[PDB]
C-alpha cells in the first residue's frame, strides 16, 4: 500500500511543469459512493478540459480519497522533447571515459564509433548490441535520477549508499553526456541515424552498468561495480569468462562441516559429516596464472578480495566469492557475429592417432544403452510406435522453431516458423511426404540459430524440417520415460514433474573418496559425437528391427535410421555479409528432439569408458555417475584416504586419456566441491548462480510492453533469492514505465498497485516481495470478477485461418487417419482442439493480448463494471476469513541452513520449518486423465481447461479428450469407470496450485507437510467434504507464512468452521472462474 505514492512522486519529478496535471480515478463497490466517484471523475475531466484548478474538488470528495480504491492516474503533458538532458546535466560533473581499441581481439568488438565500422546504413545492423527489450535507456536514466533525487536528503547508512551510487552514476553520465542519448523508435530499436556518430557498444554497457550500480548495498559492492563498469566499456569478450573461471577451483578448498543429502528429487537428510580439502599444488599455480591475467586486465580490488580469503579458506567469509560469481554475469551478452560464434565450435582436430580400442567400446556402449531403453516397447508392440507419424503430428507444438517459409491460408501470406503450420501448408499442395526424409548436403545445407549465455561460448542450434521431429519423437519419448526412473540421467530422473536439482554428490563424500566433475559443453564439434555415436545408434536400430514382427514399427525404425544416415553428413548455411558459406558438420548440437538424451548417453558411455582406464593404476568402486547436458560428474571411493599425489596423477591420467580420444578438457578433480552451469557446492552447502540480466536480454522475444515487466520481476525475485539483490524501487519504476501506455501524444495512463498485483492474466508483481496478495475486501473481489470477464478475448487471425480450406483438409485427414464416420460430432471438436495449438504462433497471441490490454484500458479510463456474479478465488477467501482468530506464537530453530545467500526472513522460515520435500503436480501429470495424454501425446492441456472440462457433463468430456488425439474406447472406459470423480480433487489441487504460485517461486522452497507448521494450523476435521478442509488448511498455512515473511514473528490459527458454511462452499467449488498469468511465474531453476 506504498507503491502509488512512489508513482505520484515519479510523475511529479519527471514532468515538473505547470502544464503537467495529475488526475486520479477511484472506485468503490457501494453504489452511492461509486456514483460520487463517477461524479469526481466527470468533474475532473471537465476541469481538465477547461484549464481550471483541480485542487478544490479533492476536499469535497475526501471520502473517496480515504476509503475508496484507486485504479490509475492519467497525465497531460506535451511532447517537451529533450527534457532528459535538461535534467541530466547536473549528474555528469565527473570526467568522461575513453575507450581502448587494443583490448578486444576482433576489430568490431571494440566500443568505437559506428562510422568507423559501418559508414553506410545498408550494411549497418544494431543486432550485435540490441538490448532486445521493450524498455528504453532513457527510462533507466530517468529512474536512476528519480531515485537519486528523492534519496538526496536522507542521513543514515542509506546516505553512505547514496554517495556511492551517485558517484557511479556520475561516472556513467559523464560518458553519456559527452555525446548524448540514443533515441528509441516506436519499436524500442536504435537506428543508424542516432548511433552514426556515437559508440556502438554504449547502450548495453550503459544498461548493464545501471543495473549493477542499482544493486549496491555495501562497500565491496561499490568496489566490484566500479571495477567492472569501467573495464566493461572496452573489454567485451574475455571478462565474465575470466572472473567466473577460478570459482571452479575455489570450491575444492572449503572444508565440509555439516552436509545435505538427496534421496528423491527434493528430499533432504542432513549430515554432520566433516570432510577436509585435499587440494594439490599445481592447481594453485594455475589459479595464480588466472589471477595474473586478472590483474593484467586492469583489476585491482577484486583480486585482493579473492586473496585475503585464502588465508583462512573459511566458509563463513566464502559467500563474498558467491556474490562475486554473480557479479560477473550482470555485465551483458557478448552478441558477436554468427560466423565468429560458430567458429568457437567449428574448429576441429580430427586425427588418425586416437585409439581404436576406445571408439569401438564407446559405440557398443551407446548401442547397449539404446537397447536397454527400447527393448520393452519395441518388443511388446506399443501403439505409440506403430502410429509414430500421427504421434509426432499431434506433438509438433512441443517442437523447435523451423525456418521461415511462405505459406498461404486462403487469402493471406505467412512466414511462420511453427512446423505444425508448415504441415498444414504442405498437405494441401501435395508436398506433405513424411516417409521420404530430405537429405542435408551441398544441395540443401542446414540453417542455424544461436544459443547464447554470458561468460561462456556460443552454442549452435539446428533449425530442421518437420520430418526429423516426426521420426525422432516416439522413440525419444520412450527413451525419456525409461530415464524417468533411471538414476544416472540427471536431466530426466524425476517423478514426472521435478529434476534432481539439489544434486547427488554428497552421499559418498568422505576422506577416502574423490569426485571428478567436468564441463562438456564444448563437445559438439568433437570426434566422439560424429561417426561412432551415430553408428552405435544404427546398430541398436538393427537389433531392435530384429526385435519386432510388425511392419509399421520396422518402417518407423528405418525412418529414424535414415534420419541418422542423413545426419552423418550435414552442411550448414552461414552468411557473412552478402556471400554464403557452407561447412561440413556431420555431428551433434541442439535444435532437435533427440540431442539431449542422446548426448547424455554418449557422455555416459564416454565416462564409463574413460573411468575403466584409471582402473589400470587405482582400485575404486564407481558409486555414482550423473550427466546433464553441459556438464557431468562422477564420484569414486578408494581403499584408503586421499592424498595430493593421487589427485594430481589421476588428473594427468584423465587429461591424457581424453587426449587419446582427441578431446580437449579442463579436467577438474576435487574432494568437497563442484562447479557446473546451474549450481555449485562448497562445504556441503548448495549455492547458485544469479546470472540473469534484467535490463538486457538474450534474444528478442514476442511479449508485450506489459508482460516483459512481469518477466523482469520474476527474474528480479529469483536473482534476489540467489543472492544478487537490486534495489526494489528502481524495479517498480521500470514496471510502471513499461505498463504506461500512450493514448495520445500527451495523454498517458499509469495503473496502480491494486490492478497489477491481483490474480489474473494481467498480474505483474506483488506489493510485498515473496508474497502473492489475495482479497478479503469488496473491491479486490469486484475488479477480479471484472477482469475475468475481460481476459477472454479473440484473435481475428485465428478465426480466419480456421475458416480456410487447408485447415479443414488437415482436420479431415487427422480424423480419417485416426477415426471416421462422425464427421460432424467429433471433427469439429478436433478443430476446436487445433485452435488450442495455433496459439503458440506469436502474432495471434499478440493480437489477443493487445486486445485484452485495450479492453482493460477502455475501463481504466472510464469507471468500473460489476461483472455479473462470476465466482473467483477472492469470493471464497472472503467467506473463509470471518471465522479465524490469530494468537502470538514462538517456534524454535531446528532446521539447518543450506542457502546462506537468501534474505534473512526467508532463511528464518527455512531455519524454523523445513524445506519442501515432495513436488505435487502443477500439471496433474500423475492424474489418471493425464496419463492418457502422456501416453497418446505430449500435449499440456492447461489446468484451466482441465478444471473446466471436468465441470461439464459426462458427454462432452469424451469429445474433448478424443479431440486431443486419444481414441474413443479408452475415453468411453474412463467415463464409465468413474475415475474423473477420483480426479476432480487432484485437478482442483493442481488448479489452485497454479492460481497461487505454490509451485512457482519462493513457495516452492517450503515444507507444508511439516509437523511444526501443522500444530499451528488448528482447523478441526469434519470430513466428507475434502476440498473445503483442504483449502482451509492451505489458506491458513498461507496466512501464517505471509505473516512470517512480512513481519518475521510467528502466529497460530483456529477455525471452528460451521458445517453450514462448509456446504455453502462445497457448491461454490466447481464453478470457479479464475486464472493466473504465464508471464508471472518465477521458476527458481531456469
Amino acid at each position: 500500500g506504498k507503491y502509488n505514492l512512489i508513482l505520484s512522486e515519479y510523475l511529479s519529478f519527471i514532468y515538473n511543469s505547470q502544464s503537467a496535471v495529475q488526475i486520479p480515478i477511484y472506485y468503490s463497490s457501494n453504489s452511492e459512493l461509486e456514483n460520487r466517484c463517477i461524479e469526481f471523475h466527470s468533474k475532473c475531466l471537465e476541469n481538465s478540459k477547461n484549464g481550471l484548478s483541480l485542487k478544490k474538488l479533492f476536499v469535497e470528495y475526501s471520502d473517496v480519497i480515504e476509503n475508496a480504491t484507486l485504479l490509475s492516474i492519467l497525465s497531460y503533458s506535451y511532447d517537451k522533447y529533450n527534457a532528459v538532458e535538461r535534467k541530466l546535466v547536473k549528474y555528469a560533473k565527473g570526467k568522461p571515459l575513453e575507450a581502448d581499441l587494443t583490448v578486444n581481439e576482433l576489430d568490431y568488438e571494440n566500443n568505437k564509433i559506428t562510422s568507423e565500422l559501418f559508414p553506410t546504413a545498408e550494411e549497418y545492423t544494431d543486432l550485435l548490441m540490441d538490448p532486445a527489450i521493450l524498455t528504453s535507456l532513457s527510462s533507466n536514466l530517468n529512474a536512476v535520477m528519480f531515485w537519486l533525487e528523492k534519496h538526496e536528503n536522507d542521513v543514515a547508512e542509506k546516505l553512505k549508499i547514496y554517495k556511492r551510487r551517485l558517484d557511479l552514476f556520475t561516472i556513467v553520465a559523464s560518458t553519456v553526456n559527452k555525446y548524448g542519448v540514443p533515441r528509441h523508435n516506436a519499436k524500442y530499436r536504435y537506428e543508424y541515424e542516432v548511433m552514426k556518430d556515437k559508440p556502438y557498444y554504449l547502450v548495453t554497457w550503459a544498461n548493464s552498468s545501471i543495473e549493477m550500480l542499482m544493486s549496491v548495498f555495501s562497500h565491496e559492492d561499490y568496489l566490484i561495480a566500479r571495477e567492472l563498469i569501467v573495464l566493461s566499456y572496452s573489454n567485451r569478450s574475455t571478462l565474465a569468462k575470466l572472473v567466473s573461471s577460478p570459482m571452479s577451483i575455489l570450491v575444492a578448498l572449503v572444508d565440509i562441516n555439516g552436509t545435505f543429502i538427496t534421496n528423491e528429487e527434493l528430499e533432504l537428510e542432513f549430515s554432520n559429516k566433516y570432510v577436509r580439502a585435499i587440494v594439490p599444488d599445481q592447481t594453485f599455480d594455475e589459479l595464480k596464472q588466472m589471477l595474473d591475467n586478472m590483474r593484467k586486465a586492469g583489476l585491482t580490488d577484486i583480486p585482493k578480495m579473492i586473496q585475503d580469503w585464502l588465508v583462512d579458506c573459511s566458509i563463513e567469509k566464502f559467500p563474498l566469492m558467491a556474490k562475486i560469481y554473480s557479479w560477473s554475469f550482470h555485465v551483458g551478452f557478448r552478441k558477436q557475429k554468427m560466423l565468429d560464434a560458430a567458429l568457437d565450435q567449428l574448429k576441429t582436430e580430427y586425427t588418425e592417432d586416437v585409439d581404436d580400442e576406445m571408439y569401438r567400446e564407446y559405440t557398443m556402449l551407446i548401442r547397449d544403452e539404446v537397447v536397454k531403453m527400447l527393448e520393452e516397447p519395441v518388443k511388446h508392440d506399443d501403439h505409440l510406435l506403430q502410429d509414430s507419424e500421427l504421434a509426432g503430428l499431434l506433438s509438433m507444438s512441443s517442437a523447435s522453431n523451423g525456418e521461415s517459409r511462405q505459406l498461404k491460408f486462403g487469402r493471406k501470406t505467412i512466414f511462420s516458423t511453427k512446423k505444425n503450420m508448415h504441415v498444414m501448408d504442405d498437405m494441401a499442395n501435395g508436398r506433405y511426404t513424411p516417409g521420404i526424409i530430405p537429405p542435408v548436403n551441398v544441395d540443401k545445407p542446414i540453417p542455424l540459430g544461436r544459443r547464447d549465455v554470458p561468460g561462456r561460448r556460443t552454442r549452435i542450434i539446428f533449425i530442421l524440417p518437420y520430418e526429423y521431429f516426426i521420426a525422432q519423437h516416439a522413440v525419444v519419448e520412450k527413451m525419456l520415460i525409461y530415464a524417468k526412473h533411471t538414476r544416472e540421467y540427471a536431466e530426466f530422473y524425476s517423478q514426472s514433474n521435478q529434476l534432481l536439482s539439489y544434486g547427488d554428490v554428497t552421499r559418498f563424500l568422505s576422506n577416502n573418496s574423490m569426485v571428478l566433475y567436468t564441463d562438456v559443453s564444448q563437445w559438439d564439434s568433437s570426434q566422439h559425437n560424429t561417426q561412432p555415436f551415430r553408428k552405435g545408434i544404427i546398430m541398436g536400430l538393427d537389433m531392435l528391427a530384429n526385435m519386432t514382427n510388425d511392419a509399421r514399427v520396422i518402417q518407423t525404425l528405418n525412418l529414424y535410421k535414415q534420419t541418422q544416415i542423413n545426419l552423418m553428413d550435414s552442411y550448414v548455411q552461414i552468411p557473412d555479409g552478402n556471400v554464403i558459406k557452407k561447412i561440413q558438420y556431420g555431428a551433434v548440437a541442439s535444435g532437435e528432439k533427440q540431442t539431449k538424451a542422446a548426448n547424455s548417453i554418449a557422455n555416459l558411455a564416454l565416462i564409463k569408458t574413460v573411468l575403466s582406464r584409471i582402473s589400470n593404476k587405482y582400485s575404486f568402486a564407481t558409486k555414482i555417475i550423473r550427466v546433464d547436458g553441459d556438464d557431468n560428474y562422477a564420484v569414486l571411493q578408494f581403499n584408503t584416504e586421499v592424498t595430493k599425489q593421487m589427485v594430481q596423477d589421476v588428473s594427468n591420467d584423465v587429461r591424457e586419456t581424453y587426449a587419446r580420444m582427441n578431446t580437449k578438457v579442463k579436467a577438474l578433480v576435487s574432494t568437497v566441491g563442484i562447479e557446473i552451469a546451474k549450481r555449485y557446492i562448497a562445504g556441503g552447502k548448495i549455492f547458485f548462480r544469479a546470472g540473469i540480466n534484467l535490463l538486457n536480454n538474450e534474444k528478442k522475444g514476442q511479449s508485450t510492453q506489459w508482460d516483459q515487466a512481469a518477466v523482469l520481476y520474476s527474474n528480479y525475485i529469483v536473482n534476489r533469492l540467489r543472492g544478487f539483490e537490486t534495489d526494489r524501487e528502481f524495479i517498480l519504476t521500470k514496471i510502471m514505465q513499461m505498463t504506461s501506455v500512450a493514448i495520445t501524444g500527451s495523454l498517458r495512463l499509469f495503473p496502480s498497485e491494486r490492478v497489477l498485483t491481483t490474480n489474473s492474466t494481467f498480474k505483474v508483481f506483488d506489493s510485498e516481495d515473496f508474497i502473492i496478495e489475495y482479497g478479503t475486501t469488496d473491491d479486490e473481489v469486484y475488479i477480479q470478477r471484472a477482469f475475468m470477464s475481460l481476459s477472454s478475448q479473440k484473435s481475428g487471425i485465428a478465426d480466419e485461418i480456421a475458416a480456410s480450406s487447408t485447415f479443414k483438409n488437415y482436420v479431415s485427414r487427422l480424423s480419417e487417419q485416426l477415426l471416421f464416420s462422425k464427421n460432424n460430432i467429433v471433427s469439429r471438436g478436433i478443430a476446436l482442439t487445433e485452435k488450442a495449438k495455433l496459439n503458440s504462433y506469436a502474432p495471434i497471441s499478440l493480437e489477443k493480448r493487445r486486445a485484452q490490454i485495450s479492453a482493460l484500458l477502455t475501463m481504466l479510463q472510464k469507471p468500473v463494471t460489476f461483472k455479473s456474479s462470476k465466482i473467483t478465488i477472492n469470493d471464497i477467501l472472503r467467506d473463509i476469513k470471518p471465522f479465524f482468530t490469530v494468537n502470538e506464537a514462538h517456534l524454535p530453530i531446528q532446521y539447518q541452513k543450506f542457502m546462506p545467500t537468501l534474505p534473512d526472513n526467508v532463511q528464518y522460515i527455512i531455519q524454523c520449518i523445513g524445506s519442501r520435500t515432495y513436488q505435487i503436480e502443477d500439471d496433474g501429470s500423475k492424474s489418471a486423465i493425464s496419463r492418457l495424454i502422456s501416453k497418446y501425446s505430449v500435449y499440456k492441456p492447461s489446468i484451466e481447461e482441465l478444471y473446466k472440462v471436468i465441470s461439464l457433463h459426462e458427454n462432452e468430456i469424451q469429445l474433448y479428450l478424443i479431440s486431443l488425439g486419444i481414441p474413443k474406447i479408452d475415453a468411453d472406459t474412463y467415463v464409465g469407470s468413474k475415475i474423473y470423480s477420483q480426479d476432480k480433487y487432484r485437478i482442483l489441487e493442481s488448479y489452485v496450485y497454479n492460481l497461487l504460485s505454490i509451485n512457482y517461486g519462493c513457495y516452492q522452497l517450503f515444507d507444508f507437510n511439516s509437523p511444526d507448521l501443522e500444530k499451528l494450523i488448528r482447523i478441526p476435521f469434519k470430513g466428507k467434504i475434502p476440498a473445503v478442509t483442504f483449502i482451509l488448511h492451505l489458506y491458513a498455512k498461507l496466512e501464517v507464512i505471509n505473516h512470517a515473511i512480512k513481519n518475521g514473528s510467528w502466529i497460530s490459527l483456529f477455525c471452528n468452521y460451521p458445517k453450514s458454511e462448509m456446504i455453502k462452499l462445497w457448491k461454490k467449488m466447481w464453478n470457479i472462474t479464475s486464472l493466473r498469468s504465464p508471464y508471472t511465474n518465477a521458476n527458481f531453476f531456469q
Partner: peptide, 7 residues
C-alpha cells in the same frame, strides 16, 4: 542466391 564452399 550466393554460395561459397568449404569442406
Amino acid at each position: 542466391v550466393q554460395y561459397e564452399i568449404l569442406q
